[PDB]
């Protein structure tokens, strides 16, 4: 009954290289460069004010890059005749990508001045003491080294643990276990890599607020989910990526505080005296970055994107292209000091204020290939199926109204000082994701028609050969 | 004829391929012990950690019931269809990070790495709160019969010498089927600590009660049909960290002639027993054996990816994702002066896998030799098929109706006994059902198109 | 592998005097050897 | 689309264009170099 099978619903999303055609033309554009400064641990703001004096910046923060392209269909070619603007369009394909990094490589670091801790569990010559009040300490550690890269026409999708609504049977008493849920969300700039403490919101699930070093305490560490990313029907989230990370153990500690759940006694034998009281059962590891090397760097080297796991092949719908880059290699925190009094020659700790500033160095250079689309029925449908908004910046135009029409808006002449309503001339907003803030760059002016003049491009030559583009 | 043959002899390969797979997996629990209401025996939370083994039982629906777009290419009378497993994947979504374990009372004497002076005398209950990391491990197991493990254990001693309390129990090598929730070796070897360790404090909590077990490749591969596993991969590493002593009454003294008698402080022999502290090493993104396709064409066993009884097994274990997230809740949110008395502490732990399976379709022609050979191999297989008959009985029956009418005809209906199907029903372990999820296209899926990519022959409609 | 036995199973207060400690160790070998067959042709020089 | 429609003939060129390679090769090199000093301050 259930599964004995003469069904066929689905019309089969297909490889984009079917209908797309590749042209002969290639271009490049790229920013001069990017960098930025900020404080690693927390953002700086006027103490009374709510406005930021310094933005919080560190390598540990994620980076998003949104890249606009101008509509190639408004774009003059040296010879435009090879296509018809009526029956066709022009859409950019992204052949190859680069990520520049110029900083000298060095590792930063983080900690917290009050850290929940009992004692050292690696070596103990005697049973520990009894928990006092506020034993938290100033202790730091290094975060896991990580390198990854993400490219696609849809925002990178992350995930994290989180607290959901309790199934309502048992009434929650104060201190009951807040429980866990998996939550997908869009990835925003400024968000934090895992420290090895797992993707979740510490703010909600950790009341102590002291269980982790400053930088991540308020934020929600997230992690990219390749599964849910890749299995997208179009691949348009990401058509490519690379990843490297490593970690190892360093120290072994205890959580300090009231035991939430006692261990079943049958799992041990009851002690006495000093051994009457069970020591804190909770252990947490100290993650430790390892030796960085010039060899494992995933940057400063070109890539070549021809085939991708998704049917999308380097196609950017809507003149839009995404890059997500994160690295801990350059996390170096330079420390500086200033003197409030330059007079006395006897060194006094009271004489110097201490500050922490940090650099973040980015660069982008993109190849592009040019692509035209022939329009037919199935074409139109298939795109209209895929995402109809994609069409929107083309000349539908409109589709036209096989969408309906507005039924004559009311423009009615009053000084407003009649009693008649407010009317405010509308409609700027073009971004559905405008809610999501993140880093921005505009290339639109920077295209050039000759790769020879650029450092990157001529590699595109060298690999594909044929050096002078118009020769054999 | 005797002497099992390569299954690719009689099996024939078809032209059709399918795919199905679960959406995903996400698991949460407590690493050290399971949670239950204190008076009750019912579990409040199941004990979960990466350290626990994972078994996967995967049903398939009988293809002979599965109508094809064209079913004509075979005869359902003379033949059957049985699924072949071409290729296998394991998804993992969690960010890579290492968990940990320990015990609040650990049998220990002192540090043996450096000693500036001879130690003191053993007191009573010197056990301490100490933790250590388990060996890193990655492995994968695939086949149509359950993965066979092994462990040490106590056997029945010879009856000659009367056992006094505290005597050394003899040891035994014991196979068993591998059950979910069981524990990887910590480097302490596969055995039952519960039986052979009365102290119960000699290891961290997690493994104390359970029996750590380990796969025995020989006996596994020794199966004539290979149906236990036709494939696998393994990676592990370890290094030493600390050097300790057991603290307790010496069971067997060292012969004095192996040393020179001391005096004073040196008169008493310190505890002879040492045990290592095993240590996981730096994890890497390179050694991951997951998130990458496999292709099974030829295996060690004569079984080639044939899944008998519509049944296929996956056994996967990894410690890479063992990360234990710690959280804290406030009993009182008022005071701004912190007090350790104000916060309860809990441990919950995540788990995530995913499964995507290629399959190839296969038909079996019959003869007597065929029929017998299988029936020889496993006759239960023919039961799930329609061949084997088996004439029935049953001349007469007397119904007397009706019985609740209490003029007594006898007391009667006794025949439930055979819903029983799984003989391994005694074995509890992880379960999944794919039966609904098949599809006839490798194009719509992320995994599949690689299958095409590898073997070529992209074929898709026009647009 | 380290194991321990209890000389007294009664008391619930742990005492180091209650357990004898032993050390046993496992060993696991296996051999599977191919072999090929060879004949000797035979003469004086051979024999010598 | 603003900046592209105009174009003059421009192009820095690959030095192997106009340069010509000859058939002759030479060598020279220093004997060796040696330096000494203090690692911390002069």
Beta bridge partners of B55: B315
Resolution, angstroms, 1 dp:
4.3
Q: Is the peptide bond before A85 cis (omega within 30 degrees of 0)?
A: no
Asked if residues B382 and B388 have their Cβ atoms less than 8 Å apart, the reply is yes
Distance from the A314 Cα atom to the nearest Cα atom in chain D, whole angstroms: 22
DSSP, res B179: -
Query: Are the Cβ atoms of A206 and B327 closer than 8 angstroms?
Result: yes
Beta bridge partners of B361: B83
Residues of chain B contacting residue C3, judged by C-beta atoms under 8 Å apart: 168-169, 193, 196-197, 202
C-beta atoms surrounding A325 within 10 Å: 19
Distances (CA, A) of B423 to A34, B174, B311: 66, 21, 13
C29 three-state secondary structure: coil
A189 phi/psi in degrees, rounded to 5:
-65, 160
Which residue shows structure tokens 């205890």? A254
Residues of chain C contacting residue B167, judged by C-beta atoms under 8 Å apart: 5, 20
CA distance A188 to A63: 8
C-beta atoms surrounding B461 within 10 Å: 10
Which tokens go with B274? 């040492």
The dihedral of CA A67, A68, A73, A77: what is its sign?
A: negative
DSSP codes, B430-443: -EEE-TT--BS-SS
Method: cryo-EM
CA distance A421 to A415: 11
Query: Which residue is closest to A248 within chain B, CA to CA?
Result: B282
Mutation site, B107, B174, B207, B275, interface C, largest C CB count within 10 A: B107
Nearest CB to C16 within list B165, B196, B249:
B249
Beta bridge partners of B197: C4
C-beta atoms surrounding A416 within 10 Å: 9
* Residue B12 neighbours by CB under 8 Å, 6+ apart: B362, B363, B364, B365
Angle A57-A61-A67 (CA atoms, 0-180°, nearest 5)?
95
A365 phi/psi in degrees, rounded to 5:
-140, 130
CA nearest to C2, candidates A428, B273, A56: B273
Which tokens go with C47? 């024999």
Distances (CA, A) of A112 to A109, A140, A332: 11, 6, 18
CA nearest to B143, candidates B82, B89, B81, B85: B85
A341 phi/psi in degrees, rounded to 5:
-135, 120
CA distance B206 to B40: 21
Separation of CA A222 from chain center: 9
CA nearest to A120, candidates A280, A335, A276: A280
Strands A223-224 and B311-318: unpaired
CA distance A107 to A355: 18
CA distance B320 to A253: 20
Residues of chain B contacting residue A5, judged by C-beta atoms under 8 Å apart: 66-67, 438
Asked if residues B299 and B4 have their Cβ atoms less than 8 Å apart, the reply is no
CA distance A378 to B148: 54
CA distance C30 to B163: 33
C-beta atoms surrounding A393 within 10 Å: 15
Please give the torsion angle defined by the CA atoms of residues A342, A346, A351 and A353, in that order, rounded to the nearest 10 degrees: 90
Separation of CA B72 from chain center: 41
Q: Is the peptide bond before B207 cis (omega within 30 degrees of 0)?
A: no
CA distance A285 to A254: 9
Which residue shows structure tokens 């004073």? B264
The dihedral of CA B406, B407, B410, B414: what is its sign?
A: negative
Residues of chain A contacting residue C14, judged by C-beta atoms under 8 Å apart: 269-272, 275
Nearest CB to A267 within list B33, B128, B450:
B33
Q: Which residues of C touch B (CB under 8 A)?
A: 1-9, 13-24, 26, 30
Query: Which residue is closest to B33 within chain A, CA to CA?
Result: A263
CA distance B294 to B312: 16
Asked if residues A201 and A162 have their Cβ atoms less than 8 Å apart, the reply is yes
A89 phi/psi in degrees, rounded to 5:
-140, -175
Distance from the A272 Cα atom to the nearest Cα atom in chain C, whole angstroms: 7
Beta strands in B238-300 (DSSP E): 239-245, 249-250, 274-279, 283-284
Query: Are the Cβ atoms of A453 and D3 closer than 8 angstroms?
Result: no
CA distance A281 to A265: 13
Asked if residues B377 and B225 have their Cβ atoms less than 8 Å apart, the reply is yes
Asked if residues A284 and B131 have their Cβ atoms less than 8 Å apart, the reply is no
A432 phi/psi in degrees, rounded to 5:
-70, -30
Which tokens go with B1? 């004829």
Query: Are the Cβ atoms of A271 and C12 closer than 8 angstroms?
Result: no
Which tokens go with A38? 């900020």
Distances (CA, A) of B78 to B62, B65, B397: 16, 15, 36
Asked if residues A312 and A18 have their Cβ atoms less than 8 Å apart, the reply is no
Please, is D2 exposed, middle or buried when counting C-beta atoms within 10 Å of its C-beta (0-12, 13-18, 19+)?
exposed
Q: How many CA atoms lie within 13 A of A442 on its CB side?
A: 3
* Residue A126 neighbours by CB under 8 Å, 6+ apart: B128
Query: Are the Cβ atoms of D12 and A453 closer than 8 angstroms?
Result: yes
CA nearest to A248, candidates A138, A328, A141: A141
CA distance A134 to A115: 10
Residues of chain B contacting residue C14, judged by C-beta atoms under 8 Å apart: 105, 124-125, 127, 199, 201
Distance from the B322 Cα atom to the nearest Cα atom in chain C, whole angstroms: 25
Angle D15-D18-D23 (CA atoms, 0-180°, nearest 5)?
95
CA distance A200 to A160: 5
Q: Is the peptide bond before A400 cis (omega within 30 degrees of 0)?
A: yes
Helix then strand then coil, in percent of chain B rounded to 5, is 10, 30, 55
Q: How many CA atoms lie within 13 A of A68 on its CB side?
A: 10
Query: Are the Cβ atoms of B247 and C3 closer than 8 angstroms?
Result: no
SS (H, E, C) chain A: CCCCCCCCCCCCCCCCCCCCEEEEEEEEEECCCECCEEECCCCEECCCCCCEEECECCCCECEEEEEECCCHHHCCCCCCCCCCCCCEEEEEECCCEEEECCCCCCCCCEEEEEECCCCCCCCCCCCCCCCCCCCCEEEEECCCEEEEEEEECCCCEEEEEECCCCCCCCCCCCCCCCCCEEEEEECCCCCECCCCCCCCEHHHHECCCCCCCHHHHCCECCEECHHHHHCCCCCCCCCEEEEEEEEEEEEEEECCCEECCCCCHHHCCCCCHHHHCCCCCCEEEEEECCCCCCCCCCCCCCCCCCCCCCCCCCECHHHEEEEEEEECCCCCCEEEEEECCCCCCCCCHHHEEEEEEEECCEEEEEEEEEEEEECCHHHHHHHHHHCHHHHHCCCCCCCCCCCCCCCCCCCCCCCCCCCCCCCCCCCCCCCHHHHCCCCEEECCCCCECCCCCCCCHHHHHHHHCCCCCCCC
Residues of chain D contacting residue A453, judged by C-beta atoms under 8 Å apart: 10-12
CA distance B219 to B149: 9
Distance from the A138 Cα atom to the nearest Cα atom in chain C, whole angstroms: 37
Distances (CA, A) of B394 to A182, A466, B397, B417: 59, 87, 8, 19
B306 three-state secondary structure: strand
Beta strands in B208-299 (DSSP E): 211-212, 214-215, 231-237, 239-245, 249-250, 274-279, 283-284
Mutation site, C4, C14, C18, C19, interface A, largest A CB count within 10 A: C14
Angle A199-A201-A203 (CA atoms, 0-180°, nearest 5)?
150
Distance from the C40 Cα atom to the nearest Cα atom in chain B, whole angstroms: 33
Please, is B29 exposed, middle or buried when counting C-beta atoms within 10 Å of its C-beta (0-12, 13-18, 19+)?
middle
* Residue B402 neighbours by CB under 8 Å, 6+ apart: none
Q: Is the peptide bond before A398 cis (omega within 30 degrees of 0)?
A: yes
Distance from the B36 Cα atom to the nearest Cα atom in chain A, whole angstroms: 9
A302 phi/psi in degrees, rounded to 5:
-70, 165
* Residue B66 neighbours by CB under 8 Å, 6+ apart: A3, A4, A5, B81, B438
CA distance C45 to A138: 88
Which tokens go with B349? 């732990």
Helix then strand then coil, in percent of chain D rounded to 5, is 0, 0, 100
Separation of CA C12 from chain center: 37
Mutation site, A184, A220, A229, A258, interface B, largest B CB count within 10 A: A258
Residues of chain D contacting residue A75, judged by C-beta atoms under 8 Å apart: 1, 4
Which tokens go with B354? 């995913």
Asked if residues A375 and A22 have their Cβ atoms less than 8 Å apart, the reply is no
* Residue B111 neighbours by CB under 8 Å, 6+ apart: A123, A125, B242, B243, B244
Residues of chain D contacting residue A467, judged by C-beta atoms under 8 Å apart: 14
Which tokens go with B84? 């072949």
Residues of chain C contacting residue A269, judged by C-beta atoms under 8 Å apart: 12, 14
The dihedral of CA A188, A193, A199, A200: what is its sign?
A: negative
Instruction: Please tell me which chains touch B, using 3 or more CB pairs under 8 Å as the contact test.
Output: A, C
């Amino acid at each position: 009954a259930t599964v004995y099978l003469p069904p066929v619903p689905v019309s089969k999303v297909v490889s984009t290289d079917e209908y797309v055609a590749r042209t002969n033309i290639y271009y490049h554009a790229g920013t001069s460069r990017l960098l930025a400064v900020g404080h690693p641990y927390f953002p700086i703001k006027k103490p009374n004010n709510n406005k930021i004096l310094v933005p919080k910046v560190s390598g540990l923060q994620y980076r998003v890059f949104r890249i606009h392209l101008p509509d190639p269909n408004k774009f003059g070619f040296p010879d435009t005749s090879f296509y018809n603007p009526d029956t066709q369009r022009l859409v950019w394909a992204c052949v190859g990508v680069e990520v520049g990094r110029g900083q000298p490589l060095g590792v930063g670091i983080s900690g917290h001045p009050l850290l929940n801790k009992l004692d050292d569990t690696e070596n103990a010559s005697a049973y520990a003491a009894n928990a006092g009040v506020d034993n938290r300490e100033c202790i730091s550690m290094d975060y896991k080294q990580t390198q990854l890269c993400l490219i696609g026409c849809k925002p990178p999708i992350g995930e994290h643990w989180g607290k959901g609504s309790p199934c309502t049977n048992v009434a929650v008493n104060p201190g009951d276990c807040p429980p866990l849920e998996l939550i997908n969300t869009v990835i925003q700039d400024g968000d934090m890599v895992d420290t090895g403490f797992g993707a979740m919101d510490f703010t909600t699930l950790q009341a102590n607020k002291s269980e982790v070093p400053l930088d991540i305490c308020t934020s929600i560490c997230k992690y990219p989910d390749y599964i849910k990313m890749v299995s997208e029907p179009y691949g348009d989230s990401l058509f490519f990526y690379l990843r490297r990370e490593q970690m190892f153990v360093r120290h072994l500690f205890n959580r300090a505080g009231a035991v939430g759940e006692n261990v079943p006694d049958d799992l041990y034998i009851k002690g006495s005296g000093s051994t009457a009281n069970l020591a804190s059962s909770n252990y947490f590891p100290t993650p430790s970055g390892s030796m960085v090397t010039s060899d494992a760097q995933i940057f400063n080297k070109p890539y070549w994107l021809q085939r991708a796991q998704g049917h999308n092949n380097g196609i950017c719908w809507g003149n839009q292209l995404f890059v997500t880059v994160v690295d801990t290699t350059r996390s170096t925190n330079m420390s500086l000091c200033a003197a409030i009094s330059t007079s006395e020659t006897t060194y006094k700790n009271t004489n110097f204020k201490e500050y922490l500033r940090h650099g973040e160095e980015y660069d982008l250079q993109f190849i592009f290939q040019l692509c035209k689309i022939t329009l037919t029925a199935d074409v139109m449908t298939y795109i209209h199926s895929m995402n109809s908004t994609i069409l929107e910046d083309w000349n539908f135009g409109l589709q036209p109204p096989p969408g309906g029409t507005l039924e004559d808006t009311y423009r009615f002449v009053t000084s407003q000082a009649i009693a008649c309503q407010k009317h405010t001339p509308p409609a700027p907003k073009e971004d559905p994701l405008k809610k999501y803030t993140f880093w921005e760059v505009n290339l639109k002016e920077k295209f050039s028609a000759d790769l020879d003049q650029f450092p990157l491009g001529r590699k595109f030559l060298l690999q594909a050969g044929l050096k002078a583009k118009p020769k054999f």
